[PDB]
Task: inverse folding
């Protein structure tokens, strides 16, 4: 039950999101990291706003720091975001 | 108590937030819109995960979208985030 923001267009994911919601999913998670986090809030915004206002709330938002491997076997840090949209209760 | 994420280097804003708490700030909000959001999360993470690991955490995170009167009689929407960090008591 999760849609990850990749290279595809923002509207490509609100599609994937609503699709899982259509297919039942009671909570769909919109995950992203790095600069793709802006596109993540984009998706969740267009969904709750433009398409599923009536019956879809933001259940919670949680952030974090993932780890990226560098040429030195050491690791960099990249912010991440998790937006869980749930069916309006 | 607010720090808006502009273009400035990350650290300038993290340091900014910190200074706020350093003065007693019992809660600070890292706001950003558009492509900045991702950088709004960088900040909030670095603060609660590194420079203030022992005395500050995420009290809550908010999202939304806003109108921006632009070219001609047109308004553009942009996503917005308001990460709230509170003092650990
Ligand atoms: N948890 C974090 N995002 N920490 C800071 C890394 C953010 C960004 N990738 C940078 O290095 O500027």
Result:
């Amino acid at each position: 039950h999760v849609v990850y923001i990749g290279k595809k267009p923002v509207m490509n994911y609100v599609l994937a999101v609503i699709t899982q919601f259509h297919e039942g999913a009671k909570e769909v998670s919109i995950k992203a990291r790095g600069r793709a986090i802006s596109r993540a809030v984009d998706v969740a915004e267009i969904v709750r706003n433009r398409f599923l206002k009536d019956d879809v709330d933001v259940k919670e938002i949680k952030i974090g720091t993932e780890e990226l491997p560098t040429a030195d076997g050491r690791t960099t840090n990249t912010s991440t975001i998790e937006i869980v949209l749930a069916r309006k209760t």
Q: What stands out?
A: Residues 1-89 of chain B form a domain with the Translation Initiation Factor IF3 fold (CATH 3.30.110.20).
